[PDB]
Amino acid sequence: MKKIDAIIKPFKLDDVREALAEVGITGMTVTEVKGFGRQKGHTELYRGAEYMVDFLPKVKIEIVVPDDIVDTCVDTIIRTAQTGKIGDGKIFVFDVARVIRIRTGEEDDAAI
Amino acid sequence: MKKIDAIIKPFKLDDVREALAEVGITGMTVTEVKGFGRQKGHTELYRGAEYMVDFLPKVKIEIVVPDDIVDTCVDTIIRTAQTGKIGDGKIFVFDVARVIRIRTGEEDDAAI
Amino acid sequence: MKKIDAIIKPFKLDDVREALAEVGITGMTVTEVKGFGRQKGHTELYRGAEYMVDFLPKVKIEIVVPDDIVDTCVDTIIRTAQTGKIGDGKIFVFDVARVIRIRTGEEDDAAI
């Protein structure tokens, strides 16, 4: 099993969510975060202006899925989140050591 | 050492926090997130209604602990967070490569 | 490549950001979180008072960088975030399995 983190433009959240539901994902956690970096019209992190602000609101999606559906998840996220413009974001994949269901105390095989 | 992420129902935060303090945990970071998925009365992610909203507020707890107390932490989280109902959440465990104390620049043995 | 998570005192965010820009970091995601734990004037998590609150606002920074610049990033974070007082926070480093650019569908070598 793997944890997939995706930092996307907020307006694409519903499309990504709909598409991920189609592939069979049953749970997703979403965090609102501030992104600093790649932005149209700018060339730098830290402009350090007095009244201007350098951040852009972003949405971080986290799903934990079986190894075999990782590529299907990655492919569907890119397809539904990509605009071809600056700031589309990135997908990071991480190995998970254990996955425990709180309701029953039962573990999922973290190697699937 | 391992990083433990737990996504729990918000009302259980104080109980989980109290119980974790008893076992000796001295620090915890908490993020408010939106959960999509398993919910009483529903059968799907993405209902895509115009006025209804599909998310439920959740609380994500992150602690970084020694390998030997991971099971004690997992067991105490389940005990204090479990309701036996839909949406209790999950616990994910991740390996940590390095842990650095900012105040002193000193590292903890990430293998403990 | 590695993922660096740093939990810092909010007022140090701009300094850390400026310094990280100097070393060449081009993107950073920031989450506002609540920290429980090490605090001046206190000796415990969970005081469970009726009107008092036990949390302190914190800022979590997440950057994903090449293995060779991890120490440079860690060193610059400590330098710019350290106050020498209680509550300076910690830096955790995690291995990343894959890094995918959403705009182009192109992967970065996660082993660099």
Swiss-Prot record, chains A, B, C:
- Name one process (GO BP) from the record: regulation of fatty acid biosynthetic process
What does the UniProt function comment say about this protein?
P-II indirectly controls the transcription of the glutamine synthetase gene (glnA). P-II prevents NR-II-catalyzed conversion of NR-I to NR-I-phosphate, the transcriptional activator of GlnA. When P-II is uridylylated to P-II-UMP, these events are reversed. When the ratio of Gln to 2-ketoglutarate decreases, P-II is uridylylated to P-II-UMP, which causes the deadenylation of glutamine synthetase by GlnE, so activating the enzyme.
Instruction: Report the Pfam families cross-referenced here.
Output: P-II
Specify whether GTP-binding is a keyword of the entry.
no
Description of post-translational modifications:
Uridylylated/deuridylylated by GlnD.
Q: What is this protein called?
A: Nitrogen regulatory protein P-II 1
Instruction: Cite a single GO MF annotation.
Output: identical protein binding
Subunit structure comment from the entry: Homotrimer.
Keyword Lipid metabolism in annotation: no
The chain residues annotated with the modification O-UMP-tyrosine are Y51
Q: Which domain of life is it from?
A: Bacteria
Starting at the broadest rank, the lineage of the source organism is: Bacteria, Pseudomonadati, Pseudomonadota, Gammaproteobacteria, Enterobacterales
GO CC, sorted alphabetically, is:
cytosol
Q: Which family does it belong to?
A: Belongs to the P(II) protein family.
Q: Which InterPro entries match?
A: N-reg_PII (IPR002187), N-reg_PII-like_a/b (IPR011322), N-reg_PII/ATP_PRibTrfase_C (IPR015867), N-reg_PII_CS (IPR017918), N-reg_PII_urydylation_site (IPR002332)
Query: Which keywords does the record carry?
Result: Nucleotide-binding, Phosphoprotein, Transcription, Transcription regulation
